[PDB]
Amino acid sequence: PASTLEGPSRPVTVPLREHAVDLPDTDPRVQRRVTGWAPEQIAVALSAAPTSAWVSWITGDFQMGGAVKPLDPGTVGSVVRYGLAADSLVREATGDALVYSQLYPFEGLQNYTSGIIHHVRLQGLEPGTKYYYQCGDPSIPGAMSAVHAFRTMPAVGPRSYPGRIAVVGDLGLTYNTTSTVEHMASNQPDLVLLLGDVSYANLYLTNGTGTDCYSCSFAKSTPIHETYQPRWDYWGRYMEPVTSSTPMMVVEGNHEIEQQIGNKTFAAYSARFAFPSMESESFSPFYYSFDAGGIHFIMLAAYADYSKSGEQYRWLEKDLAKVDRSVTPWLVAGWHAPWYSTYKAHYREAECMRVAMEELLYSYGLDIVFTGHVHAYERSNRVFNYTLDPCGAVHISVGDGGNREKMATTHADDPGRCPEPMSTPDAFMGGFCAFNFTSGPAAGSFCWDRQPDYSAYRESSFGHGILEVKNETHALWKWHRNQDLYQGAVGDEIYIVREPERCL
Ligand SMILES: *[C@@H]1O[C@H](CO)[C@@H](O[C@@H]2O[C@H](CO)[C@@H](O)[C@H](O)[C@H]2NC(C)=O)[C@H](O)[C@H]1NC(C)=O
Ligand SMILES: *[C@@H]1O[C@H](CO)[C@@H](O[C@@H]2O[C@H](CO)[C@@H](O)[C@H](O)[C@H]2NC(C)=O)[C@H](O)[C@H]1NC(C)=O
Ligand SMILES: *[C@@H]1O[C@H](CO)[C@@H](O)[C@H](O)[C@H]1NC(C)=O
Numbered sequence: 001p002a003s004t005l006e007g008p009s010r011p012v013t014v015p016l017r018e019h020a021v022d023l024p025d026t027d028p029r030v031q032r033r034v035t036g037w038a039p040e041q042i043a044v045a046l047s048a049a050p051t052s053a054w055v056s057w058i059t060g061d062f063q064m065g066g067a068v069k070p071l072d073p074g075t076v077g078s079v080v081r082y083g084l085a086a087d088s089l090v091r092e093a094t095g096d097a098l099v100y101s102q103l104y105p106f107e108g109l110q111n112y113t114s115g116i117i118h119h120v121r122l123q124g125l126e127p128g129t130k131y132y133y134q135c136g137d138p139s140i141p142g143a144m145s146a147v148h149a150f151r152t153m154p155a156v157g158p159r160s161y162p163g164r165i166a167v168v169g170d171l172g173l174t175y176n177t178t179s180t181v182e183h184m185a186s187n188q189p190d191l192v193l194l195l196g197d198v199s200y201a202n203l204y205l206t207n208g209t210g211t212d213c214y215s216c217s218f219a220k221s222t223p224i225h226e227t228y229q230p231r232w233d234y235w236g237r238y239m240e241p242v243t244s245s246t247p248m249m250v251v252e253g254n255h256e257i258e259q260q261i262g263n264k265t266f267a268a269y270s271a272r273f274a275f276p277s278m279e280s281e282s283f284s285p286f287y288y289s290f291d292a293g294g295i296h297f298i299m300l301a302a303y304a305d306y307s308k309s310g311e312q313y314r315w316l317e318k319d320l321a322k323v324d325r326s327v328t329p330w331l332v333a334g335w336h337a338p339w340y341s342t343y344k345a346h347y348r349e350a351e352c353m354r355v356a357m358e359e360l361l362y363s364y365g366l367d368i369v370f371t372g373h374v375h376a377y378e379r380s381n382r383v384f385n386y387t388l389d390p391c392g393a394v395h396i397s398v399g400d401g402g403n404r405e406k407m408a409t410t411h412a413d414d415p416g417r418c419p420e421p422m423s424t425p426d427a428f429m430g431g432f433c434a435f436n437f438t439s440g441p442a443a444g445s446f447c448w449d450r451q452p453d454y455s456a457y458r459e460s461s462f463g464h465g466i467l468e469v470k471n472e473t474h475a476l477w478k479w480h481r482n483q484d485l486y487q488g489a490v491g492d493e494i495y496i497v498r499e500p501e502r503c504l
């Protein structure tokens, strides 16, 4: 495979092939397979440092429709027993419990409230080490989980890396999603990054009817952008074989907004997952940082204020200033919305976020950016401010996890497909920053008339990526497509080589 040391490569577009079906609520993997207060939807997340980790789970069925009665989270305890051997769970941690509701004050819409969600932080863990654990409430008969196990991230240092980091976005919960996840799990990742757009509960009305495109079907005929929150529980139950054994870091996408009563947003996302918000001092579920071996990861919020005057930007400045590249040589970011996608879908939609944050990240030598959102695969050449730049980050977009929305297939540079500029900005975040180019091949235009030279590879296929950091200067990236199932199939592969003496 190529190497970024060779410089930028001639752009490649894979010709199109010529929707996905959501898993039904009858699927055995989404049905409730425990009773009473026994734990379900068990999931591990990283803390900010390898020496700590989060275990989360839900106890009790949700309520959908009727006069929902939110549960009292204080009635079921939050206990994890853990240890270095399955028969010796001699350490104990306790944590917090909460519920969330999804309420709509419109006649004919149905309300939802969750089971009790638990989050417990395990402290004093050895890096790079397998821990066995059980979660639940030991004072309630039958309310402890089976024994599970996960491995902590390796110790932070310039020769110490997780073997395989899986990167996915926009999974949803379709049969194609199960293909993505099966392929991903067969690659046995040490860590999963999920770059927003998790369950696509907001493709459904509160009465359970779904669609491939809410705006197309329901935008005009509903009083709000509705959700069917049980899709989250179905997703959490389906994913448990992965999440109970493999740490998973989630960052929010636009499908997590899920606006409800009182203009409340992000309720399900903020409640269901654990984030290292306290440990990384973001104090936000929407953005945070963590170390996995010698990689400093930054998860940024495309859907929280990212302007230079805001809290996120100030936090990012402080986070970057604390990075010691002799301890964590790799600096990698993830967020939902791509900055350099060349598909028509969401073309230049996050331009205001790029304009706000790109120079700061470039000045600190950001190595790789992972995003989702665009339902296709794309890899950029090293780029900064639309210019091929040997010190610019590699931008990779893997929003092709398999949800039921349409694939992104048209390119903004396709003849006649360049969108109207004022149609492109993200409506939820506001602003307009996407001005016509003033230099380069596309000077004076909003789009190129051919694949832009900062786009190395683009393909309209579902799949997932794996990052294999080898040492302080070399990392192997591989993207795997779903329609390929033979042993070792790879759709795109690049050796990413960093040059700190050149760029820092
Ligand atoms: C779902 O929960 C909401 C809030 O608890 C209820 O909202 C009410 O809806 C009516 C119109 O249908 C409004 O006139 C009320 O002002 C709303 N109440 C509040 C506190 O905002 C709603 O009744 C619940 N839906 C069901 C079927 O129980
Ligand atoms: C999503 O999953 C479906 C069903 O598994 C895939 O449907 C197949 O597509 C291939 C071509 O890639 C055809 O050979 C098959 O005949 C299709 N099967 C059916 C039942 O339709 C679908 O291709 C997947 N979607 C994407 C974008 O990969
Ligand atoms: C849900 O409500 C919508 C619009 O009110 C309706 O078209 C649809 O048929 C309903 N679905 C069910 C299962 O009732």
Ligand SMILES: *[C@@H]1O[C@H](CO)[C@@H](O)[C@H](O)[C@H]1NC(C)=O
Residues within 6 Å of the ligand: 263, 264, 265
């Ligand atoms: C409603 O919620 C969103 C997200 O917090 C916010 O951006 C928006 O400005 C709020 N709307 C009003 C009228 O306050």
Ligand SMILES: *[C@@H]1O[C@H](CO)[C@@H](O)[C@H](O)[C@H]1NC(C)=O
Residues within 6 Å of the ligand: 359, 385, 438, 439
């Ligand atoms: C990016 O390019 C535009 C157009 O040349 C320029 O006006 C702008 O100042 C550049 N931004 C940075 C951070 O250099």
Ligand SMILES: *[C@@H]1O[C@H](CO)[C@@H](O)[C@H](O)[C@H]1NC(C)=O
Residues within 6 Å of the ligand: 418, 436, 444, 445, 446, 447
């Ligand atoms: C920007 O480029 C588009 C074509 O991509 C063109 O239609 C538009 O008029 C241009 N606007 C300006 C201010 O140059």
Ligand SMILES: *[C@@H]1O[C@H](CO)[C@@H](O)[C@H](O)[C@H]1NC(C)=O
Residues within 6 Å of the ligand: 470, 471, 472, 473, 474
């Ligand atoms: C770093 O990793 C690459 C790929 O595994 C290897 O070729 C190289 O020798 C390693 N160390 C260096 C260049 O210092």
Ligand SMILES: [Fe+3]
Residues within 6 Å of the ligand: 170, 197, 373, 374, 375, 399, 403
């Ligand atoms: Fe998406």
Ligand SMILES: [Fe+3]
Residues within 6 Å of the ligand: 196, 197, 253, 254, 255, 336, 372, 373, 374
């Ligand atoms: Fe999205």
